Symmetry: D2
Subunit: 259 residues, 4 copies
């Protein structure tokens, strides 16, 4: 038998809303593997859900941070430094684009909506990686969540496609810059999973059924499959893997035209 | 001999500073091919030189527009519409990132520097495509300029790599959205060329040397090689090509280790 | 106007069967630009129609060569050497996989069928590049044809996808090796075109109609669009471009879903 | 603590010569995790090491099979079926190119050498996948080993690069074809590790030493890092992952320059 024991390890998981959150799926596996887990949630309105998540993990520290707010980010990492001392793992599971940007055409994206989507969904990784850098121990890691539309056009995903392209390029540069400290940086490209944010993509259910039709495994992936890949990449089992975008999508993205 | 005749065609080329500007290389080829060319320049400061470029083309309309100013962009496309009635070609040859963003580590990029880089270097394609769309005729096209660092780490290119990654994904979505109206969208991935903007990349000389050492052709590309590719992509010869990032880099980007 | 003038340039186009052949489209454009074009065809049974193609091009030189027969390849380049003295352009428009391989599953491909597919569709490029190398002039080039199934799974393209992956990797290595000599090597990734070879892909008509529905341009490409890209890549207008796979597919391969 | 218990599961690992073999590292992890392992070695001359490897694992069935020999492959899988009744995991850690193909230029590769390289290094995945299919249980998988020269030119890796492009394309097609039964197919793209075979790449030590200087992690990967990725991809932890080429190279291949 192989055991993954992360006793002694400290994890901060940013971007949890409820138990369907992919950030949460990774937090669960990290806690199960023995790490101490802190969750960050976006706004006070989400505190009651974050409390339920801490409880479902059997214990987790909670912190409020909006990634557009540099003061709140400073306070987060100050709080994590005080509670943990050093940090091993950082999970970045945050994305946003304004409803109107997702519902219209990409070409019709308003300037301030476009910038907000990039700010929240891509710049935030840089914001948190910079603040995490002095805390992160040798062997530690940052993992983010991205989607195939960075490479190929998925209708209605619009500015998020572009944010994910910026997010993946960021992963490579941060991997290059944090690598000498023995800190790894990777992206999980997840296939469609029915989360809270899934409702924000028009035609998500079409995407979802389409993936299950065409993917090599002829099924959608699960939250736990994302959780397990996040666990692996953060664990010492993945000690030689950095700067990568690793797909957990039942093979969907390798497919060209079928039927 | 085969002929590329763009008589009757109207081009807008955005982002010329001087005669070494990649956008100007594409402008010169479109003009030589017989197209009528309008140029846009960033700021009143650049006007005297913009006029020298208009002159080197044997005439070109000039418009000033900073792509962070939506009203300047509105005015620019009102001006083009009045002057030309419509448009066939749009060249987007615009990028910027603060000096501090390019001198430091990517991880140390300040929020507002990061956002400005993406706004000027990527969002601008969207802002100009939207405005050009009602003017753009069937057979028409948009071409932008990118660099390999979108795909692979080129140290110190930093936030511009991320902006180019955004630019390239923008090219794909914009190709998808404009294609039904018969308008193509492509990016040219140029290798290093000594332009005014190259002086804003600290390691440029090192990059230039690596390319000459490593590239299949054992040399750097030229301004004219960029111009010729832009001409081709905008021309009817490229009528089947859209959503593409085409490399003009002497083969550099296909090389691994040597 | 710009003029592409290839007067005095010499081309060999390998893999013509009929007027729909992609190699023929590129031959016709090279001839239009003023190049002298020789053609090669595979076997005696194809000679009558090949002669008609040669006649269509002002009476082009015609050679027989099966790329599995090294002796025929030697005779081909000896004959080209005698006729032209050297060579500027080489077009490689040749693929085959046995019917058994294409109609089954990839996993069920027989050893000998798989090897023949790779030999004809991938190794042949190395075989002709090697023999062309001493004839090839500075500024010269080789262009081959591929399909996006090298990167993405297209059911029933089977071993040919794998041969095309081998082909594209071959293009990168040959570009590296011929580059010092000022010879470029590139691939054209064409979208579906209704050629005689199309009948060898089960369900091709389904594939063709799907492209029209979902490509950015909401149509298939044409044989001529392939011919124009071949011309461009071989011409000095593309002098900065080597080791590339350039897609002419109406944008199809950029679409991720639907 | 989270556990991976592969008790009850059966593995065939093909291509061990050495305790430094990447195939052996994967077998060691599979055995650690609880799996019953079978090993195939190439030739009678490797029996004694094979036996010591089987000792090192704590016991392992041994078989001899040359991947060019269909009868030896049929006997392998009949033997495996007899001993295990079914298979859960197949590791394909086999590659070969003739010395002469590796030592010069890709363009100079002789027909027989090119074919054999493709036959042993790419076709063998299909041959073994076909024979494994009826034995392979739902949740089962196949993992192979590749190298980044499939996408980027590494001089002197030559035909092996082309074989790896074929292999990775084969992984995508076999993943598609085996996916319906709940069987996954993936590739590990390893960075340089000092094995017997590494020495058959001219300049390997300098390639090895260069990675340690330029990789994001500023070191080479270890045999154990490959073994852990193999274990992960074959285990249920990777149940959502198929058709993937996963890089374990200390980030080396993300670098674009310097
Ligand atoms: N669900 C999927 O099918 C899928 C597929 C691929 C990638 N992803 C990515 O996974 C990540 C997590 O999304 P999810 O699907 O779990 O949905 P989710 O809604 O559960 O999580 C998204 C989180 O982003 C947070 N967030 C948004 N704006 C924020 C801001 N300004 N500051 C701080 N937090 C903010 C929200 O509060 C929320 O917790 C995202 O990056 C998403 O793009 C999701
Ligand atoms: N020179 C190279 O080696 C190279 C290589 C690859 C890609 N590129 C790209 O080519 C394009 C052209 O750059 P170039 O090298 O010709 O240099 P350049 O300086 O001649 O052109 C860049 C232009 O961007 C304009 N610009 C910057 N900010 C602007 C703003 N706010 N509003 C309006 N215009 C603005 C500048 O005024 C300038 O004319 C850029 O997108 C660049 O990233 C250049
Ligand atoms: N038609 C398409 O939609 C399409 C799309 C992408 C790529 N391609 C590629 O374009 C190239 C040309 O094919 P095409 O579609 O014009 O069909 P085609 O039938 O007109 O040309 C293919 C040629 O290959 C030749 N050939 C086959 N085996 C040979 C051998 N042993 N020796 C010498 N010649 C041999 C045939 O004689 C034939 O002329 C091929 O490589 C094909 O894979 C075609
Ligand atoms: N070592 C590295 O740095 C590295 C990097 C990337 C990929 N790889 C790949 O990993 C795999 C394993 O190689 P390795 O480095 O562990 O070296 P190795 O020498 O330990 O393993 C190579 C194996 O291939 C076998 N083989 C060759 N021809 C065969 C044939 N005809 N029939 C059956 N077996 C045959 C040999 O017997 C040998 O056991 C290979 O596919 C190789 O291409 C290695
Ligand atoms: O990136 C995603 C991809 C998929 Cl398939 C499903 C959900 C995703 O996540 C989001 C999508 C849109 C917005 Cl506005 C916010 C988020 Cl978190
Ligand atoms: O993108 C580029 C790539 C190269 Cl190799 C050289 C110059 C380039 O163009 C720029 C680089 C930095 C800034 Cl601030 C602005 C511009 Cl226009
Ligand atoms: O590669 C191709 C791709 C397409 Cl879409 C259409 C035709 C093609 O060409 C071939 C396909 C199969 C065989 Cl057996 C031989 C050839 Cl020339
Ligand atoms: O593919 C490889 C890549 C690397 Cl970096 C090191 C070793 C490799 O493996 C081989 C290399 C050459 C030959 Cl002839 C056979 C094998 Cl197994």
């Amino acid at each position: 038998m192989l055991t993954v024991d992360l006793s002694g390890k400290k994890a901060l998981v940013m971007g949890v809303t409820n138990q369907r959150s992919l950030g949460f799926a990774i937090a669960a596996k990290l806690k199960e593997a023995g790490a101490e887990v802190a969750l960050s949630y976006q706004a006070e309105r989400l505190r009651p859900e974050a409390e339920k998540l801490a409880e479902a993990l059997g214990g987790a520290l909670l912190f409020r941070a909006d990634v557009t707010q540099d003061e709140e980010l400073d306070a987060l990492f100050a709080g994590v430094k005080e509670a943990f001392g050093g940090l091993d793992y950082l999970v970045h599971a945050i994305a946003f684009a304004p409803r109107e940007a997702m519902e219209g055409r990409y070409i019709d994206t308003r300037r301030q909506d476009w910038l907000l989507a990039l700010e929240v969904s891509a710049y935030s990784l840089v914001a948190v990686a910079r603040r995490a850098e002095p805390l992160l121990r040798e062997g530690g890691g940052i993992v983010t969540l991205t989607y195939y539309a960075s490479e190929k056009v998925v209708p209605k995903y619009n500015v998020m496609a572009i944010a994910k392209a910026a997010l993946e390029a960021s992963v490579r540069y941060l991997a290059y810059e944090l690598g000498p400290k023995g800190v790894r940086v990777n992206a999980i490209s997840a296939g469609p999973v029915r989360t809270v944010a899934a409702r924000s993509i028009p035609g998500f259910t079409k995407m979802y059924d389409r993936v299950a039709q065409t993917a090599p495994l002829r099924r959608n992936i699960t939250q736990e499959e994302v959780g397990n890949l996040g666990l692996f990449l953060l664990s010492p089992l993945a000690s030689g893997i950095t700067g990568e975008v690793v797909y957990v999508d039942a093979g969907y993205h390798i497919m060209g035209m079928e039927l």
